[PDB]
């Protein structure tokens, strides 16, 4: 999708790569589908039962895996990620893995459009829409 090149241009590109790699006899250019890439990523996370969120941009997809994770989850995650990366590279899909504690450190709050935090009984904080 993202490349609009003519066959002649592709041939020229091929020849220049061949000039950069003096040990290679020829370079074969193959066109792949982005939807396929993104799909295999998301299906792999579901196949591993990991919790995640997905975000889409003009030119990339970010899967954010964050929170309190078990040792088993961390192991499975790092194994899968290392496998996928070796196949597609880090140029289109990114994985962000972050350990988080409790979101608000264990204190009561209202999460509406007018949410707020109870610092202590008798103490309101109103920092931001939660």
């Amino acid at each position: 999708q993202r490349n609009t090149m003519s066959k002649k241009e592709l041939e020229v590109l091929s020849q220049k790569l061949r000039a950069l790699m003096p040990y290679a006899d020829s370079v074969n250019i193959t066109l792949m589908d982005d939807v396929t890439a993104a799909g295999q990523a998301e299906a792999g996370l579901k196949q591993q039962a990991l919790p995640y969120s997905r975000r889409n941009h003009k030119g990339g997809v970010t899967f954010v895996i964050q929170g309190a994770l078990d040792d088993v989850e961390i192991l499975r995650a790092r194994q899968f990620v290392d496998s996928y990366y070796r196949t597609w590279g880090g140029r289109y899909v990114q994985f962000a893995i972050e350990l988080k504690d409790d979101w608000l450190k264990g204190r009561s709050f209202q999460y509406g459009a007018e949410g707020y935090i109870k610092m202590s009984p008798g103490h309101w904080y109103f920092p931001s829409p939660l």
Binding site: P121, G122, H123
Partner: protein
């Protein structure tokens, strides 16, 4: 003793009597230890309104005319 007309009705009389004692509350407060005054005040709030009522920790304080029964043993 002051003979000038000053009160008319129950709320004005109770305020007139209360106002007459501030000359002595100011004395007790001026020599009592702030920490003890705070202890005896909090421990009365937790009797009346229940111990779950927020412990005040008035660490920077204007102690809001504390009750004399709480103020006297601190002195």
């Amino acid at each position: 003793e002051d003979e000038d007309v000053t009160f008319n009705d129950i709320s004005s009389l109770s305020k007139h009597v209360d106002e007459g004692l501030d000359g002595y509350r100011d004395y007790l407060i001026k020599y009592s230890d702030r920490e003890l005054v705070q202890f005896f005040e909090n421990a009365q709030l937790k009797r009346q309104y229940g111990e779950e009522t927020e412990t005040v920790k008035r660490d920077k304080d204007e102690i809001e005319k504390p009750s004399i029964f709480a103020l006297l043993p601190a002195y």
